[PDB]
């Protein structure tokens, strides 16, 4: 009886695979040759943030495209002005082990999570003028991968419980629970329309979910190792992941398939943080070999190397305005590249 | 140039930087210990001695140095994705109970975990602190049980001292490097702070070794 269920499941998987292959008719490489490539891109360093004394593990931009939050294993997370390199605030943490730090679009709240399975939200705009902890979203049963703000009252966290949770800031309990993944998740992204979000785990597969309903509508496979970073395409219809295979696979939403992989024989280390541009012609990837690369998001070729760091780059962020890019590495350094 | 408000912001930033440097100085004169181990491997008694959901930070001190420990094995999660976070820890405390040498292959799993954390790429230089608990009950059970059961390839006199020495040497030989990584063994002597004194002295020794290496005299 159970063997019948296994056979039915594998038959459905095969039917999905052959339907995808039938819908697969061409490649992006055979058509991107028509459009000229950009060529060579140089990103001269502009600003460097010499404030941390420990390896940082997460960074994020603000919607104002000038303020950025950086979280380091020193137990203190810092808010930075991109333009003048001024330490706006330095919030101490109840536990130095920090994995993620999120910034609200309204900028009045900052989320930060660590190995305590607790994402804490601090309130910035306060009557007292001191940054105090607002809320703690405990009860996740597993280390935190990343938290991301939907609204000033909605946030989605990704835990080592192989799960994602839509909590409620005012209440304190998770309204929606997302599960089904086999291995623990390590990254999460939000679509610009904020209606669907994707999740990547150690299963070498990325699955996307219906925010309104609360269940995943589909999943995609083909990766060889664990997924450490996911970035959504600005149009909201595609995305590219990153693994320890040095392969930045690209998947489409409406096509429900994978267009092209981004693998080169020069680099063999892992992928830590992936990012897009405002246009989406190019993407940035921070690998474990101390340098950040910038590929062509359409031509699938190496368009340059950003090698301004002497250690692995834990994270990178792109301004929603599209002006500059921040790269944060384990050498306790944030570097600004324009 | 800069306006008055810009100057005020710069001064505030410099004050916060002084605060950050002072905090880093305070935390720098502090020793980090990564305590971990298998199920019921004595860690409960270890934290019992060293005090008077995922990270159980034991906070205490000695004559000085304000030791800090981070129990991470109590929670059940993945294996080797958060372990790189503890890079730069001063020393690692390994707690293995000797009474699990008969209950099930558990000793083999413990040895595999020890090999995992010893030859881990991140822990190339940090020394290792071993702990062997329930040594008396271990003696009682090896009086009541043979010795070749644990290791089929090992035979010898069923005496407490030779068996303890053999198991210590077997654990010590598991490393793939000796010049940089050192193994410090103990026997969980009673319940007194003699274990605390031993770990303090080991921390002092490894601090001296690392300081000499930084000074280039080692």
């Amino acid at each position, epitope marked *: 009886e159970l063997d019948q269920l296994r056979q039915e499941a594998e038959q459905l998987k095969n039917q999905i695979r052959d339907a995808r292959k039938a819908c697969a008719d061409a490649t992006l490489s055979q058509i991107t040759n028509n459009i000229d490539p950009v060529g060579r891109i140089q990103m001269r360093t502009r600003r460097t943030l010499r404030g941390h004394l420990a390896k940082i593990y997460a960074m994020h931009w603000g919607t104002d495209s000038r303020l950025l939050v950086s979280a380091s294993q020193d137990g203190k997370l810092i808010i930075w002005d991109s333009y003048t390199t001024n330490k706006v605030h330095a919030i101490p943490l109840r536990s130095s082990w920090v994995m993620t730090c999120a910034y609200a679009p309204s900028g009045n709240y900052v989320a930060c999570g660590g190995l305590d399975n607790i994402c804490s939200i601090y309130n910035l705009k306060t009557r*007292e003028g001191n940054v105090r902890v607002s809320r703690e979203l405990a009860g996740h049963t597993g280390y935190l991968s990343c938290c991301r703000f939907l609204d000033d009252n909605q946030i989605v966290t990704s835990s080592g419980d192989t799960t994602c949770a839509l909590w409620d800031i005012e209440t304190g309990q998770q309204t929606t629970t997302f599960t089904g993944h086999t291995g623990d998740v390590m990254s999460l992204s939000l679509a610009p329309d904020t209606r669907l979000f994707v999740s990547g785990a150690c299963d070498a597969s990325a699955k996307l979910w219906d925010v309104r309903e609360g269940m995943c509508r589909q999943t995609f496979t083909g990766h060889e190792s664990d997924i450490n970073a996911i970035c959504f395409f600005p149009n909201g219809n595609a995305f590219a992941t990153g693994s320890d295979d040095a392969t930045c696979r690209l998947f489409d939403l409406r096509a429900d398939q994978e267009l092209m992989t981004y693998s080169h024989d020069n680099i063999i280390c892992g992928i830590t943080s992936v990012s897009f541009s405002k246009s989406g012609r190019l993407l940035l990837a921070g690998y474990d070999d101390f340098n950040c690369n910038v590929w062509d998001a359409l031509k699938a070729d190496r368009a340059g190397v950003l090698a301004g760091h002497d250690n692995r780059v834990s994270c990178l962020g792109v301004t929603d305005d599209g002006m500059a890019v921040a790269t944060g590495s384990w050498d306790s350094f944030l570097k600004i590249w324009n | 140039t800069l306006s*008055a408000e810009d100057k005020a912001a710069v001064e505030r930033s410099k004050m916060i930087d002084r605060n950050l440097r002072e905090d880093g100085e305070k935390a720098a004169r502090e020793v980090k210990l990564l305590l971990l181990g298998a199920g019921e491997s004595g860690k409960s008694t270890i934290v019992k001695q060293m005090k008077i959901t995922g990270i159980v930070e034991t906070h205490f001190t000695f004559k000085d140095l304000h030791f800090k420990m981070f129990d991470v094995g109590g929670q059940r999660s993945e294996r080797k994705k958060w372990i790189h976070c503890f890079e730069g820890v001063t020393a690692i405390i390994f707690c293995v109970a000797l009474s699990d040498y008969d209950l099930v292959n558990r000793m083999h799993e413990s040895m595999k975990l020890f090999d995992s954390i010893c030859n881990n790429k991140w822990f190339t230089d940090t020394s290792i602190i071993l702990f062997l608990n329930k040594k008396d009950l271990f003696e009682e059970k090896i009086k009541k049980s043979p010795l070749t059961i644990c290791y089929p390839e090992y035979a010898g006199s069923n005496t407490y001292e030779e068996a303890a020495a053999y198991i210590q040497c077997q654990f010590e030989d598991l490393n793939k490097r000796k010049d940089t990584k050192e193994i410090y063994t103990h026997f969980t002597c009673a319940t007194d702070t003699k274990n605390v004194q031993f770990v303090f002295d080991a921390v002092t020794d490894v601090i001296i070794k690392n300081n000499l290496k930084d000074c280039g005299l080692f």
Partner: single-chain antibody
Amino acid sequence: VQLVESGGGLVQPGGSRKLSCSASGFAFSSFGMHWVRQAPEKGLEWVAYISSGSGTIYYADTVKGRFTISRDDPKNTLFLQMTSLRSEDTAMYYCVRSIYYYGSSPFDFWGQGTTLTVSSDIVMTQATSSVPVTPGESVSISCRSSKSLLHSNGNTYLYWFLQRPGQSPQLLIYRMSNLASGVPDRFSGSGSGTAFTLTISRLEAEDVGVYYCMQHLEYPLTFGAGTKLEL
């Protein structure tokens, strides 16, 4: 949060006095402090400024040397000590907090104010000083300056304050455009260098008072003439 000032009383000309201010409800060390003098009839005038941790001090030219200040962060206290007091110093003194970071709003709070009785600048210009108003009517208040207040960084360091009859004034708009926390949205401001304005739409009660334009481009911090509303 509250600022309570004390140590004020009648003295003789050429005398000395020191006034102490106690603050509560907020991080005393993280805020810079300012003293301002309101004349018995005229408008506000800035006195002195103490930076965070006493790192920098500014004195108004009229009171340099003769006046001095200090702060004791552990007990959240401020001290303003002067000697050789003149007969012109008789006025009401206010202590104001101000914190300076990106997107911050200094002059956020104001002290209660302590009366006192004794027996180069970028001037701010207000054209009129008294205008009759009625509820439900939009009114514009204009204010000119001796120089452009737009800095090369893009900011326009201009502030607007309302002092209702009887109590300390409060910040209305900071940087001429951004509304402060807790102020109604009906207020707005606009303008360009050395000529700015503030618009009140659908005027209601409790909005009658004296309106001041203050500059923060450089020290000293001069105030406007002050425009008072009448019903």
